[PDB]
Amino acid sequence: SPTFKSAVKALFDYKAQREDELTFTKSAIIQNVEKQDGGWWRGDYGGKKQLWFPSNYVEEMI
């Protein structure tokens, strides 16, 4: 129930390649991001919850 401020901004468009991936447009704010060190993060955007996307496509809003 504590909620983390963990947002990133998409620097490029990304189209989901698998059902568990997020699709987003450049400049999107992706929210509730969990950061992992294998090149894939997960977050919320566009009505999708906790789907995966490549970390190199975004800017961390720290």
UniProtKB/Swiss-Prot annotation:
Ubiquitinated by CBLB in activated T-cells. Mediates the production of the second messenger molecules diacylglycerol (DAG) and inositol 1,4,5-trisphosphate (IP3). Plays an important role in the regulation of intracellular signaling cascades. Becomes activated in response to ligand-mediated activation of receptor-type tyrosine kinases, such as PDGFRA, PDGFRB, EGFR, FGFR1, FGFR2, FGFR3 and FGFR4. Plays a role in actin reorganization and cell migration. It is found in: Cell projection, Lamellipodium; Cell projection, Ruffle. Interacts with AGAP2 via its SH3 domain. Interacts (via SH2 domain) with RET. Interacts with FLT1 (tyrosine-phosphorylated). Interacts (via SH2 domain) with FGFR1, FGFR2, FGFR3 and FGFR4 (phosphorylated). Interacts with LAT (phosphorylated) upon TCR activation. Interacts (via SH3 domain) with the Pro-rich domain of TNK1. Associates with BLNK, VAV1, GRB2 and NCK1 in a B-cell antigen receptor-dependent fashion. Interacts with CBLB in activated T-cells; which inhibits phosphorylation. Interacts with SHB. Interacts (via SH3 domain) with the Arg/Gly-rich-flanked Pro-rich domains of KHDRBS1/SAM68. The SH3 domain mediates interaction with CLNK. The SH3 domain also mediates interaction with RALGPS1. The chain holds residues 790 to 850 of 1290 of the full protein. This is 1-phosphatidylinositol 4,5-bisphosphate phosphodiesterase gamma-1. Residues 3-62 form the SH3 domain. The lineage of its organism: Eukaryota, Metazoa, Chordata, Craniata, Vertebrata. The gene is Plcg1.
